[PDB]
Amino acid sequence: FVNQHLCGSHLVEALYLVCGERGFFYTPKT
Amino acid sequence: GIVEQCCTSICSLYQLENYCN
C-alpha cells in the first residue's frame, strides 16, 4: 500500500502503520 | 523531504522507514 502517491493524512497514516511502536517524525517542509 | 519523495513522487517502504524513530 506504500508504493503510490501518499499525501496529507494518507501519508501520515502510512507512517503510522509502517513505523508502529517506533513512532515517526513528520515534516512536510519541501 | 518526505512530501517530495512520497506525495509528489511515488513513495516506497524504504523511504517511509527513513522517517521512523
Cα–Cα distance list, A2 to A12, B1 (Å): 11, 16
Q: Which residue has the cell 515517526?
A: A24
Q: How many contiguous H segments (helices) and E segments (strands) does chain A have? A: 1, 0
What is the rounded CA–CA span in Å between residue A12 and residue A9?
A: 5
> How would you write chain B as a 3-class SS string?
CHHHHHHCCCCCHHHHHCCEC
What are the φ/ψ torsions at residue B15 (nearest 5 degrees)?
A: -70, -45
Structural domain boundaries in chain A: 1-30
Question: How far apart are the CA of A8 and the nearest CA of chain B, in angstroms?
Answer: 8
Question: How far apart are the CA of B19 and the nearest CA of chain A, in angstroms?
Answer: 6
User: Rounded to the nearest 5 degrees, what angle is found at the Cα of A26, between the Cα atoms of A24 and B1?
Assistant: 120
Resolution number, Å: 1.5
Experimental method: X-ray
- B18 at interface of A, judged by CB pairs closer than 8 A: no
- A2 at interface of B, judged by CB pairs closer than 8 A: yes
What is the rounded CA–CA span in Å between residue A14 and residue A19?
A: 8
